[PDB]
Ligand binder design. Structure first.
Ligand SMILES: *[C@@H]1O[C@H](CO)[C@@H](O[C@@H]2O[C@H](CO)[C@@H](O)[C@H](O)[C@H]2NC(C)=O)[C@H](O)[C@H]1NC(C)=O
Ligand SMILES: *[C@@H]1O[C@H](CO)[C@@H](O[C@@H]2O[C@H](CO)[C@@H](O)[C@H](O)[C@H]2NC(C)=O)[C@H](O)[C@H]1NC(C)=O
Ligand SMILES: *[C@@H]1O[C@H](CO)[C@@H](O)[C@H](O)[C@H]1NC(C)=O
Ligand SMILES: NC(=O)c1cccnc1
Ligand SMILES: [Fe+3]
Ligand SMILES: [Zn+2]
Ligand SMILES: [Zn+2]
Length: 341
């Protein structure tokens, strides 16, 4: 049944997809939508086959019967012989970052400050930090905790979208796709780097990849690691070198999902496609690389080493872990079980 339709979210992923489609001789084609939720609906309709999702969206996707297929895998020193494709995944660290110069700003003096989020419903940018905040404050009124935010996905007219910028021209303010200047892990850290916000909720890989000459992008050009700090839950402030001990939680890797009746087929074309355009593919650097997009994390995060088999053909709760499934459940009570479409 060898022909896979990828769902791209927004015009930039649409363009990267169209490119990949060409280089594959149409073994993969593209469908496009404005939001991740819409791409999820397309897959359900059967109009698209798969897409890579942050854990927060896997949860939405799972209640509707979509299943995790292969997971993103970057690389950790001690997990060495084992192949990337068979190596277990580690999950990433969700952290809260602040400007060093913002002396005296801790996890406990966050109320009324200005925040930068990857996008509503996402693990590091939303579910983990707001989960703790509802928790800590005993209030479901998370829309009144920060004076202002850029939380792609919220009501364009609420304070939660006040700090968002939209595209080149001011259009699409607060859309949960890359047209929004402060969308995703990158847009969010940018929102803080330009001091639009006091804190950004991203993952720890983001600070390292957009500081000390790693980014090339004009806004990240002069960023230095020592000018940032991580906020720990114990009210303390640490250098970004100490994330192992100052994170809010460890998140499950983004993963490709698809309808169960389509999973095997999706899995097979991907392992092949990967063999050709992944980290060491026949054709990567020279013609095309699935995992690169010059600091934008288009379709896939730019630090993905390979997509890996899951082992224990896990359901989505098994993939997310009970720990995280319950964090999302408790937070979702504020805004009991069904495909939400
Ligand atoms: C926010 O507070 C809630 C309430 O204690 C935390 O909740 C529960 O999480 C623990 C540990 O994972 C579970 O054993 C309980 O079953 C959960 N309680 C309920 C009523 O569901 C919640 O996880 C905290 N937020 C974070 C980010 O950890
Ligand atoms: C925090 O995020 C950064 C960037 O994504 C990670 O940085 C690298 O660590 C890997 C191995 O862990 C090395 O191969 C790279 O050299 C590091 N990057 C840079 C630019 O120095 C880092 O692993 C993460 N740290 C934690 C605690 O999660
Ligand atoms: C497309 O898929 C077919 C079927 O597996 C494969 O034989 C062929 O090499 C692929 N072509 C390209 C250009 O990827
Ligand atoms: N998703 C799972 O079932 C699982 C099992 C063991 C380790 N990691 C993930
Ligand atoms: Fe994420
Ligand atoms: Zn931990
Ligand atoms: Zn299982």
């Amino acid at each position: 049944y060898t022909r896979v339709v990828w769902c791209a979210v927004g015009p930039e992923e649409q363009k990267k997809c169209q490119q990949w489609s060409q280089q594959s001789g149409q073994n993969v084609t593209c469908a496009t939508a404005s939001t991740t939720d819409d791409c999820i609906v397309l897959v359900l309709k059967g109009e698209a086959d798969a897409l890579n999702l942050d854990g927060g969206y896997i949860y939405t996707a799972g209640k509707c019967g979509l299943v995790p297929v292969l997971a993103e895998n970057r690389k950790s020193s001690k997990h060495s012989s084992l192949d990337c494709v068979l190596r277990p995944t580690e999950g990433y660290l969700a952290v809260a970052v602040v400007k060093k110069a913002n002396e005296g700003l801790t996890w406990n003096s966050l109320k009324d400050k200005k925040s930068c989020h990857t996008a509503v419903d996402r693990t590091a940018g939303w579910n983990i930090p707001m989960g703790l905040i509802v928790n800590q404050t005993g209030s479901c009124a998370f829309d009144e905790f920060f004076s202002q935010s850029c939380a792609p996905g919220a009501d364009p007219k609420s304070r939660l979208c006040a700090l968002c910028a939209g595209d080149d021209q001011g259009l699409d303010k607060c859309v949960p796709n890359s047209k929004e200047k402060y969308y995703g892990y990158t847009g969010a850290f940018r929102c803080l780097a330009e001091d639009v916000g006091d804190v950004a909720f991203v993952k720890n890989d983001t600070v390292w990849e957009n500081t000390n000459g790693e980014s090339t992008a004009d806004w990240a050009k002069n960023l230095k690691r020592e000018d940032f700090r991580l906020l720990c839950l114990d009210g303390t402030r640490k250098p970004v070198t100490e994330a192992q001990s100052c994170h809010l939680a460890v998140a499950p890797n983004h993963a490709v999902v698809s309808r169960s009746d389509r999973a095997a087929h999706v899995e097979q074309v991907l392992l092949h496609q990967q063999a050709l355009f992944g980290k060491n593919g026949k054709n990567c650097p020279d013609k095309f690389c699935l995992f690169k997009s010059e600091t934008k994390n288009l379709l896939f995060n730019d630090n993905t080493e390979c997509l890996a088999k899951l082992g224990g053909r896990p359901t989505y709760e098994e993939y997310l872990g009970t720990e995280y499934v319950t964090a999302i459940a408790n937070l979702k009570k504020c805004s009991l079980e069904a495909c939400a479409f």
